[PDB]
Design a protein around this ligand. Sequence first.
Ligand SMILES: [Zn+2]
Ligand SMILES: [Zn+2]
Ligand SMILES: [Zn+2]
Lengths: 381, 431, 182, 249
Amino acid sequence: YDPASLPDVLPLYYRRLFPFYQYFRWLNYGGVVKNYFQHREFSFTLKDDVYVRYQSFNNQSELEKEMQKMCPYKIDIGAVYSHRPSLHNTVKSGTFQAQEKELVFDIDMTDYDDVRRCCSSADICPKCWTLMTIAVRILDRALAEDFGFKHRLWVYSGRRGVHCWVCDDSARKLSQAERSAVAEYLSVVKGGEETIKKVQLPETIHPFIGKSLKMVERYFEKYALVDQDILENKQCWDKVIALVPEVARESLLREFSKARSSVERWDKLSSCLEATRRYSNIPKEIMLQFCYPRLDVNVSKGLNHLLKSPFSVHPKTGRISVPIDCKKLDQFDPFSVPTISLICSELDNVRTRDYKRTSLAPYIKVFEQFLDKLDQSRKGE
Amino acid sequence: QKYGSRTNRGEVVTTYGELQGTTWNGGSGSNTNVELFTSLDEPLTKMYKFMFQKLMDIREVVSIKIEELGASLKDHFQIDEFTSVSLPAQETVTVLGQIGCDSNGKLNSKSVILEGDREHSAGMQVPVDLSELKDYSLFPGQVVIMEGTNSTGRRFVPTKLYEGVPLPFHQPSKEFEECPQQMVITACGPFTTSDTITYDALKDLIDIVNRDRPDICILLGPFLDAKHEQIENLQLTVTFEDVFKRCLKMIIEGTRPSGCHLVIVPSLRDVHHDPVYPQPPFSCFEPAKEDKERVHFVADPCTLSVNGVVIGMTSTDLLFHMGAEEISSSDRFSRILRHILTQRSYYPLYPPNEEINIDYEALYSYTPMPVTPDVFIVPSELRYFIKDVTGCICINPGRLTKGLVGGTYARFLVKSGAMRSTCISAQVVRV
Amino acid sequence: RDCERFKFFCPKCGTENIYDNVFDGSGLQIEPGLKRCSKPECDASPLDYVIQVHNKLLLDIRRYIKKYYSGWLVCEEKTCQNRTRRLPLSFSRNGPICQACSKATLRSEYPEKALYTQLCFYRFIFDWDYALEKVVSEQERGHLKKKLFQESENQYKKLKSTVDQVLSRSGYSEVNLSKLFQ
Amino acid sequence: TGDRKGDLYPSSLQFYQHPPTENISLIEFETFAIERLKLLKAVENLGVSYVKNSEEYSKKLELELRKLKFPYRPLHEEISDDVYDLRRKDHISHFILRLAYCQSEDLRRWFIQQEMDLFKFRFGLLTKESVQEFLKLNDLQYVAISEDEKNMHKEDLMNSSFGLSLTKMEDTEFYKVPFQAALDLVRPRKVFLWRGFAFIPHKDIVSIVLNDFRAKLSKALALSARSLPVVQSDERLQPLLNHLSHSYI
Ligand SMILES: [Zn+2]
Ligand SMILES: [Zn+2]
Ligand SMILES: [Zn+2]
């Protein structure tokens, strides 16, 4: 993909591929609340990194128009305000307030850098994507069981991670404090680059942590012991040794000198820890420190946060921010995600059904199913 | 002793109207309908909390009195503009205000001041020079409109004093066109001799009532006088309420044979009642079930409707109060009565006399005269009279007892739509 | 401290009795004020002439109400001290402007607070329960909380009922909680 | 219910939501105001001197409440006239003090603190039956999980509540609350969440009740400070309310 080719393709996509009808269905939420779509904030990033916010639109036609006119490189969705953002200058000071917004989570592979060995920075590979695969299951289950949020849209971020939009009416009316509470409840791996032991579970395992460890276990052997090989050599297993009390460290080292496979080393570590009881949760702390999602509480706490819009185009990879089907999560491949260049090649190879002829169709289908569920909830209620 | 041996019993001391026989008879309140005059303002029928007057409230009440009367007079006289009283005036200007005395004594022609209202004068006063006024009659608290000049800015010189404008009489409905003439016997306290507490004059009056069978009996206080020598020196062996209850029982039970509607008006001299004007009605007596429809405990002042005839009545000695303060250029009682009627208040004197306690909010709410009454009962220590003032029959029946000697009462006949001769005949008679 | 005390002339001896408290005396010698005359040679008990006490109380209440409604105003300036019954409509921010000097405010000679305090004092000098709780000591309270004083207690309650009735009709003794809390 | 009583005062504890509408005397006004000021000052002094859970605190507070004749204990007899009177006292006095303690933020905070303390104490003296009655009369609608559902989530509940023993847990009943109200509990993960509801044990319930109370009370004080000009014109009540905080008791 040639990023110099981005300015050539962006218009066509925004003209014949961007799913505006479903997009308006989403952000309009069945028209129940008046001025809901009209008070939504958008922000655009144009060529040469020119940023504009407090953009609002009257209806789908105005949005389609101004978007096709601007051809933005980035589209971010923001809060629904007390008035129309376009007229925020006209609103008396203090009377312009963000009132409702989806509850959103951003999981970014870059935040896992201190604990992955295959890639670094913005590089991803099939060996590390399983971490995202774990996160979506660990988090989404909580959101479906502990909090009872029923309408959850998971979206690929385009490069390094995934976003989650929780769109239940209750989740859209949550205050800042309630959002911060939700984020802290879901958050376990606490600390920066200056801390080595980032998980310190108490004697009692809270049911949520038990279910997160249960989800982790299913994948741990493949991710950590086979793929990541977190015990390949001394430079790496020294870390895991650094994560357990010194008392057994020596006892482990000799054992790790006689083990040929990291699965064997994990068995040995588990046996040694079991023999050594307050430390019976130490293996769980290691698993969490290598597998549990990291959440930027600043992303989810603030109501006025602008997050990458679904079906955006990644300025560098060119991939489309496509929704991820929860059931088919295990089959999701971030490298097969349609790029803008591929879908423009597909478009120029054959009115409201043009996208069905591209590789974008199944993802718009997943989005349509999610919107159908939202409509059913709006009606039934 | 002196009262019991009197020789002028039944003498007619004053007469007015159509001559009637030596004996008067009534309908015993058969075809009689007595109520309170239904005007825009609600009547005073229950006690109101008093003893708490803010000077600001008094100011507002007085100012609105002046303003309202001046507005009515301005509409009537087609006056263009009122001018501030205090400002100098080299040419003739029309000024609205109220009269007063520059000192605490009694008003005289050299002590007259005019105080304006808040709307046109910011409440400012000005001395008045009555040298250029040929004819006038002024009392304190009188709302007046005058044409005059103020050349020095310090002394107003009136040249014209606008006359008063009485309210229109009542236009009775035809509902009472077929009702007969009604007989009213009115008496005012004190009801007992100065040296007795037995109510002998009241017994004589009750006998007269049962004999003549009037349609209405209007009894004005005091019923237990505060100035009674026995009351002041604390020689009474029973509580004031008990004496008053005995008196009211005597009145009500003794009038049972006559079947006469009794209208009881309190007086500021009633030692047992709340000392405040306008006085609320008596509320310490519950008439038996057979007298509930006959007894009317009304307020002071009262405007009563009797088969369409409007009777104004007040226990307060208005004539004595205003005679001590009215100044005239050259009948004095007729002038005072016309002043009362034209000011459209049952107590237009300000400041009041020393013997009356005035709650000014209640005064504002319950002293406006709704219309000009057909009959106006004004008992006074002055001599009894029956006068015709601007078509209103003003009756002073005196007081039933004058010290140690018996007094007088009045009897009159009222019919709605007669001939304006709503008062067929009236007589001040001796007890 | 600025309220007039209750003066009652004994019907028998004619000596003035000043009442300023429910109880007179100290210790076991303490008895209600209206039990014995102030003159040692006089054996008359004012509690016998309670009708007269009631009448005098009503007359005094009338006197104080008349004093209040007289509406006497005095200039606050020492060098003016103008005394008038007439309230002028010309007001400054502080109240009526004295028309003698035109530079000082007219103050009521007998304000509403004075009358309210006088009525409250007349209630106080007949408040048996309040005197027992606050004014009276412990041994004195014990001596007064027995029989031999029940009749005096009943008469004092009746006499306090009069002042309570009068105060119930005063706009300065009722608080309308509806107007405060809305 | 002798002469002029009613169902206006069902329970001892109340949130003080509805202002009084009666016409009281100035003497009653002053007596109630001063008495509740004494009660609140006693609460503050005992809170400073002793630990609020201490038995000395409870004994001294009960003594003060008895001395000033305020409602502090329930009575499973009926609404006796005397009891009614006491409750009326409490209800009027509270609002009077509101008028006294809304002029300045400092004052407001002080008032709120004392009131909360008193309320907590009174709740601590409520029998379970009475407690439920209260929770119903104010539409708090705390149940309360069934026994069957409790057995259904037995292990989750056991691992949720810190320091809860198996049998002791069997002896306890939880409540279902929307998670938006248990922020302080959920945030450190000390209460189980299932389908948007937290399962909160009982000692703790007073906390939630108090939270609600505090919210309401703060709002009320704001409104009172907004309605101050109407009261300053009443000279009779100005010396008291403007200076109650500095009144010798
Ligand atoms: Zn990788
Ligand atoms: Zn004596
Ligand atoms: Zn002066």
